[PDB]
Amino acid sequence: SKPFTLPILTLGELTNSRFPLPIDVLYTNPNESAIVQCQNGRCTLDGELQGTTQLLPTGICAFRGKVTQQVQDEHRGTHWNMTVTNLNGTPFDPTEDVPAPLGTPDFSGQIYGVISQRNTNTGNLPANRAHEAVIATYSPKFTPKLGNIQFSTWETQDVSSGQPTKFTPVGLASVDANSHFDQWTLPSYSGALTLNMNLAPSVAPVFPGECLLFFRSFIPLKGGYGNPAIDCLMPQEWVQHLYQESAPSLSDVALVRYVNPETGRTLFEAKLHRNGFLTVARNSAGPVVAPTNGYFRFDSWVNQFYTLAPM
Amino acid sequence: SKPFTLPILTLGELTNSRFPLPIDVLYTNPNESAIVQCQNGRCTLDGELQGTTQLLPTGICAFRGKVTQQVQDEHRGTHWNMTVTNLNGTPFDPTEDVPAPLGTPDFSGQIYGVISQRNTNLPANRAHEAVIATYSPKFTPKLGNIQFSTWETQDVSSGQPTKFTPVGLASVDANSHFDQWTLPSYSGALTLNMNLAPSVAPVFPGECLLFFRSFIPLKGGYGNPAIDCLMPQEWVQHLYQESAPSLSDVALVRYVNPETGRTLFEAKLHRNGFLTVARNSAGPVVAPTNGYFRFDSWVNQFYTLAPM
Ligand SMILES: C[C@@H]1O[C@H](O)[C@@H](O)[C@H](O)[C@@H]1O
CATH class of the missing domain: 2.40.30.120 (Positive stranded ssRNA viruses)
Structure with a gap:
């Protein structure tokens, strides 16, 4: 069975899978009330593209x-x-x-x-x-x-x-009230009053004290006030990597460590779930303040019962 | 010694390393008179980025x-x-x-x-x-x-x-000075460019460069401009990650149809990060976009490529 791996790209070498932007920061928002069910940047750990996800950053x-x-x-x-x-x-x-x-x-x-x-x-x-x-x-x-x-x-x-x-x-x-920007509200792909189909599934933490971890990019504005961001579950390079490595998932959850390659230290650890998203043990909203030379390193396959070290 | 590899992305899954565009076709132009010395999409086979090349497609x-x-x-x-x-x-x-x-x-x-x-x-x-x-x-x-x-x-x-x-x-009108192989003067016209990735060229008779070509949009006017890169951005990202030692100056790669398993043609992938083929004509390479390059073996500068 082919060993699971992640690319060794640092945060400053990653791009967003939901809009053509560099990744700017890691981000959490535990009190998010919306269902998180984005359709771009969706890929299982064993390489199955889902939703509307395709490989080209230009697409x-x-x-x-x-x-x-x-x-x-x-x-x-x-x-x-x-x-x-x-x-x-x-x-x-x-x-x-x-x-x-x-x-x-x-x-x-x-x-x-x-x-x-x-x-x-x-x-x-x-x-x-x-x-x-x-x-x-x-x-x-x-x-x-x-x-x-x-x-x-x-x-x-x-x-x-x-x-x-x-x-x-x-x-x-714009991100004014009448421009209806909501990054977690899906379009109605077939028009008003119609049901979307063939969606990649929603994602959520399943363990107490955990929350989703996003790769966040700030998105430019033609006009008006605001600092809008787009949060993706995994960067586009991870989608590309997983897709080519079709490594079997040996459990439902991979343990990954965010490492500072300069110092060699683990800054924090996270669960990388089989469906292609991350959770962390963090009790706050906002950016993860860490150097952009940091990168995630695959440690081992664990399970849903594994308790993460608090961030 | 870590084995050399290329990604298994097809042509329709690749993007240009010199402009943010998808790869549209493989392309040759044997009679090109310009020196080819582009600075984006430059990477040695053992993962050394060169010129102005960086990893982000957005960059x-x-x-x-x-x-x-x-x-x-x-x-x-x-x-x-x-x-x-x-x-x-x-x-x-x-x-x-x-x-x-x-x-x-x-x-x-x-x-x-x-x-x-x-x-x-x-x-x-x-x-x-x-x-x-x-x-x-x-x-x-x-x-x-x-x-x-x-x-x-x-x-x-x-x-x-x-x-x-x-x-x-x-524009690509005459007064808009579009020439994909003319470098800017990065410091202004009387100053020499420095730290450049080296020029690339076939060194063997009957060979020509093989490019990954993308058509680039125009704001106005007439034209069908294209940008040719030596390797797609995904190859740059891959080589940089792997950093596989180069065991000779030339890798032999095969363009394969995965459906039939057949090799459509072969090419030299040079250590400095560019392709040549034995082709005596200009224009697109007519091949399915599910085709991809597969690393075969290390050869040398004297290896004779099968004619395309
Ligand atoms: C050739 C002409 O170039 C102009 O810039 C355009 O505005 C026209 O539509 C037309 O294509």
């Missing part, structure tokens, strides 16, 4: 497809419908047992980015354009599981119908 | 720093002087043995992206489209400062933390 909260037409929307700006395909360009098959095309955003909010187009038709070179764009994942028109979504632009005219279109995510447009 | 062609001054363009647009730090926020030390801050773009062109700011003193935020002309005399990242330009005329704040997220190219 996270990305879309590929074609603009169909400008559409009316009550909300501010100029709005456009685009059909979406799989990120590799093949048609998205709604009958596949996934919640939405892989890479689809997994939270409620106004996602800010750039829409770019390279025309199909044509020194036999195609015309191009790109503009800032916003995708409101809470919108009734956000229906990626049905193969189309809507985005809005400040630009009023220069978006072409029927041309190949890419959305590159950059941040959030 | 490639990224900048971090603070705006110091607004300067209007003579014709159109607004320019902003920016001091740059290391991507991890620590001050960039120009005496470090690197060409420029890690992640600095490694080619001539107008790089299009978004500048975003989150103030220090809840904080205020703003973002706008921006262009960094890497051929500009004001592009001097090794000296710790660059300039970017905006369509926005006023709403960029001085003395506030600033992030550049690259998206594509502004």
Whole structure:
């Protein structure tokens, strides 16, 4: 049986699996009342991708497809419908047992980015354009599981119908009350009033005094006040690593130690659960203040009854 | 001796190490006249990062720093002087043995992206489209400062933390000086670049470089620009982790169809971290994107590759 391992990347060498951002800090929030059930950055310890998780850092909260037409929307700006395909360009098959095309955003909010187009038709070179764009994942028109979504632009005219279109995510447009940013609220992938399907399962601590440990990134804002963050269960590099090592899980829980390679000391220990998330024995909310050269080291397989040293 | 390996990621599971793009195709161009000496996506087979190469996919062609001054363009647009730090926020030390801050773009062109700011003193935020002309005399990242330009005329704040997220190219018109193999002058035009990753080339007759190619978006105009990297970012990350000793100067690798188990072609993976093939034509390699490279054995510079 192939031994389980984690990459030896330090915190400053990791990226978020839920938005294309570096990992900034480790973070806890024991009193979180929301159900934690994100769909990107989901991978079992034996390498099974779940939810909408795919391997490309460039695919996270990305879309590929074609603009169909400008559409009316009550909300501010100029709005456009685009059909979406799989990120590799093949048609998205709604009958596949996934919640939405892989890479689809997994939270409620106004996602800010750039829409770019390279025309199909044509020194036999195609015309191009790109503009800032916003995708409101809470919108009734956000229906990626049905193969189309809507985005809005400040630009009023220069978006072409029927041309190949890419959305590159950059941040959030706003986190004001009317922008409905909630990182733990899933979009309705098939539209308002419809049930999401094929979801990766919720995660939670199952042991007294333990709480989830997140890899947190701060996400840029187009405007307004705020310091929004996106918390992922494991960084994208871990998803990539686990996926290639398909190492058998020898118990439900791995014991991992956060180590300072400079000093050799263990800063704290954590449970790495089979479904792909971490818990720690910590009684507070907020960042874990530790050097970013720290990294998690796999120690051994333990079980649900193992008591973690308090952080 | 730790065995050399490559990740088992397929083409459709790889990303470019020189720009944040997925790999679209493998590609050759035997008649290329330029010296190939890119500085991102550079890593030896035994895990030594070189040039401006760093591990984060988010760091490639990224900048971090603070705006110091607004300067209007003579014709159109607004320019902003920016001091740059290391991507991890620590001050960039120009005496470090690197060409420029890690992640600095490694080619001539107008790089299009978004500048975003989150103030220090809840904080205020703003973002706008921006262009960094890497051929500009004001592009001097090794000296710790660059300039970017905006369509926005006023709403960029001085003395506030600033992030550049690259998206594509502004233009590939003649006056936009896009040339993926022309390095920026990291310290300005009269100064020599330093600490560079070495140039790469075939040393054997009938061989040519094999690239991992991505098509890069354009803000406007005509074109279908591409960026070619020597190895995808996932290979850089893998080699750095493994640090497997290199047992000869050349590894022999096979591009395999996992469905059929058959080898489609073979290539030389050179110690300095680049591929060559025996191919006498230019253009994409037509192969399924579930194909992947598998390490076969160590060979040498005199090994004759099976023609593609
Ligand atoms: C070639 C032209 O480039 C401009 O920048 C674009 O705004 C137009 O849509 C068109 O593609």
